Design a protein around this nucleic acid. Sequence first.
DNA 1: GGTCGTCTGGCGTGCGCGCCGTTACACCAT
RNA 2: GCGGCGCGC
DNA 3: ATGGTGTAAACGCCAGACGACC
Lengths: 985, 212, 201
Amino acid sequence: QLSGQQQRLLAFFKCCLLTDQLPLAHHLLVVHHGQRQKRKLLTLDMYNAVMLGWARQGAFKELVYVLFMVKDAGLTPDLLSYAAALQCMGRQDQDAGTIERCLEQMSQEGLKLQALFTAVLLSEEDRATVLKAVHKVKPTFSLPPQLPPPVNTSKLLRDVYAKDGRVSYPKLHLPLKTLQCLFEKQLHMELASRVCVVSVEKPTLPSKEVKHARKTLKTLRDQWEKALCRALRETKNRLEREVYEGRFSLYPFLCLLDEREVVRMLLQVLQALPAQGESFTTLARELSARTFSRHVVQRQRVSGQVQALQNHYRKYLCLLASDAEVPEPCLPRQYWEALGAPEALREQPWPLPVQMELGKLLAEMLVQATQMPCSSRLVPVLYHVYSFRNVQQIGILKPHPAYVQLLEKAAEPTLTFEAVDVPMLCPPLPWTSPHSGAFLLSPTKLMRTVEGATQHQELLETCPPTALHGALDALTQLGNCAWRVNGRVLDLVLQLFQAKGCPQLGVPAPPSEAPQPPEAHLPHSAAPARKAELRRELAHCQKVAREMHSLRAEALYRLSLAQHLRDRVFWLPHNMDFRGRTYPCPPHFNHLGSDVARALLEFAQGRPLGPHGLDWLKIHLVNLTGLKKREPLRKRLAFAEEVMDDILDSADQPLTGRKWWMGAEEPWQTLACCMEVANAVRASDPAAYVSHLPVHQDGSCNGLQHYAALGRDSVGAASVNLEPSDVPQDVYSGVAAQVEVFRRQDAQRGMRVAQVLEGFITRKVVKQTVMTVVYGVTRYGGRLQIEKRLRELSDFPQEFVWEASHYLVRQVFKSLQEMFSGTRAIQHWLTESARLISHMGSVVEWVTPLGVPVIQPYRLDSRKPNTRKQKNGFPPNFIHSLDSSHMMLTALHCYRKGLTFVSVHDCYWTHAADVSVMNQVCREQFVRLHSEPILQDLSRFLVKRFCSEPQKILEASQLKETLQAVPKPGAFDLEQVKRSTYFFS
Amino acid sequence: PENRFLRKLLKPDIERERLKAVNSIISIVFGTRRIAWAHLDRKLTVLDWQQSDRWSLMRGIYSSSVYLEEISSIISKMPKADFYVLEKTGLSIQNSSLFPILLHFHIMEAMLYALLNKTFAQDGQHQVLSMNRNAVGKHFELMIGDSRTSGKELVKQFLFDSILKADPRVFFPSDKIVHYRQMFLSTELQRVEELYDSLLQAIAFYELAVFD
Amino acid sequence: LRKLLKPDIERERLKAVNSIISIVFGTRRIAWAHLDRKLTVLDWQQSDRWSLMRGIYSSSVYLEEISSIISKMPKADFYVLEKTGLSIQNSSLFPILLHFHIMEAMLYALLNKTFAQDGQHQVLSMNRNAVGKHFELMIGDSRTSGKELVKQFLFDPRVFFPSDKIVHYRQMFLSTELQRVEELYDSLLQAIAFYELAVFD
DNA sequence: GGTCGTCTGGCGTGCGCGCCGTTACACCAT
RNA sequence: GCGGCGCGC
DNA sequence: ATGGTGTAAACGCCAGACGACC
Ligand SMILES: Nc1ncnc2c1ncn2[C@@H]1O[C@H](COP(=O)(O)CP(=O)(O)OP(=O)(O)O)[C@@H](O)[C@H]1O
């Protein structure tokens, strides 16, 4: 029997508990009582909340009155009321007899003394006071002792948690006292949510007009601030009048934050408003979300958690500090839990109805409060306009054109960023639970959900806690990597950005460089063709200008943070999606980005090169140029030494002289590597030089590499380089040659389509089709992809593209089956199982080998599943869970040997010296992962989760027949992977 | 230039002497989800104001058998009057994305013209006409740029406050004012923009054309 | 009969029909035909060009044109209007779709005279593909002009031309053959298809 | 109500990030 | 989340 | 320049739908 008003009043009482105005809530409660119809909506939870609020400040009489009210009502007193009574009895230091009588009455109802400590959550001070009271009553009562933390005993994760093995964990370079001040700097930056960053645009000369405009802006903003403060005071004065007389009001909510941060937030919202308007509901939702976030951040200063976090972080930094030492080294999470950890309390958001009214109260206060001179009588700034948006009629707030002209005239050189979208200035908090994560004073979700997804977290919270430790440790390890910004590349990029930028290298161009159509004095309407082409040219020019503006809008925001974070050390935390892949939290400036973003980043900590570092640097450079991809490593190294003069020429004088790096696929990373190689060669001892640049190792076609491993295909594994070889194998060339020989044999016997296609089959036509098989590519999409490439080709006759495209799709799909057969068998088996379990009315659920439960969100509009999307999505989502697990196993095994490991998924990055160790660990963990039976355990879990019921056995029989028809494997041996050279090379 | 102003203001061409002797009008404003109307007289009094909210229209299909049975029910409550005033919008066929709204507006306007214009076969004289939106907005100074702003403040001045100023612009009945105030208080939470526009358009019709 | 007729009409009243009028219109002219229960034509006329479809869209002009055309049409118990095939996703067919919907709304509103009193529908919508498949002029969405079928029926025929009126239809038929008129043939074809399918099983 | 074969219309590679915009256009008077 | 674009695996 | 004006009609497949029977 859920009702809106009941939930509204419950939120009201909880907010009054968070704030200090308890007697106002006591007034609304007494007044709601005394109405025959207003009494029925009251609930036991409200009474217990008011009782706890009165108990926390030691008001004995009010608890007696609330107990009298509950006794007059028919509600049964829960154990939380007993805990609140004992808290007050303890703090007031009353006589032992009364508290003993209270415990006797609790025993009369059958409640347990341990239950109040265990069943209901309470604050540390509250539990301490209750313990003191019961100790005063009975001094022999002792809480049960704690236990040593559990350890994972799974087969795949057994060696990580073994104590007997030798370990050598990495340590940071910065001293302890240096690390302590960065915590204070990050705390200061987190306390004030907004961050101001100077823009990288060219400074304009200030004239008299711009100074006049800025003076007018300053005076108007001061008047607006005064008006907003007075309006907020008057609004708070009357809404509170509503609480008297028993009406509900957002007055408890409006006194949550002080007047100053509300006025500043409203002014920032007014500053962020576009020229054309924005929907009213969006403003309401943004205002409600922002004020809730500000309350969550600012409560922690008053509650006193910041001091405890400071002390525990100061003690925790001894493990990561260079000068300090610990008795026994261990993992960061184990050390964080060995010391007393701060208790974290999860918070519940307000209901939507309470959130939606707060946006309107404060979005309608702004329009009335602000006024502007005509430029006499004052004319308002903000207006209500009814308009059309997204094929719908909505309401829109619109500003004054004079405001827009004044803001365009004055050029503000500053930009604004949120605190969550900038990198951290201190090492992040370790991952210990799905509730506690990286950020110091902001909550973060373990899995990224687009909207309204609660089934992921529910499955993450009902698993045993021991299963998630591998994932948590991998995320914590990825969090602790230290970064710094390269400066020479930044200076060159800014030098090209401020002038007209080069667009082939990835730097956008200013809007003034857009092409201009010729202007003719003759009217276009005189001739039909003239006016026909003029409209098309004008529309095309407007469209390309609109496209050009957004790229510079992106590049400015990307390039501001690089200038901001120069000469600083920063960290990047990580999260996950529902399948298991890992992504960084800051979106604007991180790795997993483009060429320019990757060229700026480098490692803060440095390692000596060693006897084999320079060779790996040269091989990485040759890989980045991309000229040689079909050759062994020896020939890449031989090619590297042949072009050293161009490397030195590019390193010494980048933009003047021969420009060799611009011809590469990745020019900026090529230049960043060439600079370091030129530094290393000129040194006296190359083996003693310090390096800060990552080296990349990746493997082509990971999904086929996993499908071949599952089915043990002998012919399939050779193409994807699972078997040992001297020269790497390319699947695309094999597909092209099979298609070519099919065309060659078919052309002789009665064909004309094959006759014209001679010489036009290559890697380019089939590359996208072969790449997209892991996702399901149907025949329709394949024919579209082949048609696009055929149209781009010029020599081919355009009339016969249709039959040729059909022929190519048919022959590539015939060629794929000959090489890959077990892949098709397993894909069909998973498709059939998904189809049947979707027909029964359930979504697909499985468990990864490392213990992470995965569920699929697809669902039609207590809602019916969608069969097609589940069936098409199951096979590509299985392999990605297996790709993530090799990565999270490889990272945890690389940590023990003392390595710095960072990975963009399917690619591995590390220092120059550690490549061999990383390769051996990767191959060993791959062999260990696929040696275990995967398909049989998947079948057993499916037969246990689904088809386990005594009802509808007829539909159960077909599922049992289908699920147990696991395909048989091949004769390929898995131990040969360890000797492979180009697995992830 | 008064004649040219009336040609721009009112698309149907009706003789001036017939407009001088009008006794009552009804203004109709409709949207994707609502329709409303109001009643007025030579000495401006407001006998009726109402809205029809729930219908099963738009969605994805357009069927005449549903439009007819809904419009025939809506018109049943409309009382007799000498003229009916419809609002015309600046939307056109050029807006490719907004074309379903244009379909809805044109179908509803055509059915209103066909049903409400009785005795056309016998006499051949019109009783339904269209009035422009922006021209009405410019007479109340509600136009910033090319865009018309809301007029809820103006009806808040007309009702819930009584400043005569020796020439009030609109009259309300004594007995029915409480229901009007209650309805206006109910509609403040979710803003329906057609109820105000109907009354404003009626006042504009009486001022610009009848009394000129 | 969802596939044939969009408005749901009961089976009892559908079969017991004395006469029916079929209306087919286009972008230049409108034509109708009158046939009673026995397959004998009573009235077959075509209209000249109208002022519509040039530039602006106005409702008064539509009202005057339709009120001029409806007056000449005689009374019948049921009216059948064609349901053509157009897609809202297509961008180049918007004005024709708008004109068709405005004309359909005008005809539905004006013809149902008693609907304000009794509440029954006297206007029906029939799809073109059902007629094209039944009479097999052109299989599928394609449409044969149908002149050869009309020459087969007029000048054992299915439709009978009554005496003393055959000369008028012959005089009209020999004319306008060079002109591109299709509504005259389609109206009669729709009437015969309605009488074949909806009536006499 | 459940079901029960049977003809028809929609759809056709996965996941994760950014920026912009919402009758337009040519002319003419002042 | 309606449209036009860009990026990573 | 702005204000203000005028102008713009190429194939296959499968999850439902359901009328009727049960
Ligand atoms: N695993 C993957 N799945 C889908 N698209 C991918 C992909 N890896 C790369 N791409 C896409 O493929 C393009 C990269 O071109 P390439 O660098 O040639 C891919 P490749 O597999 O490395 O072939 P290559 O080894 O010959 O370079 C980009 O558009 C990128 O988004």
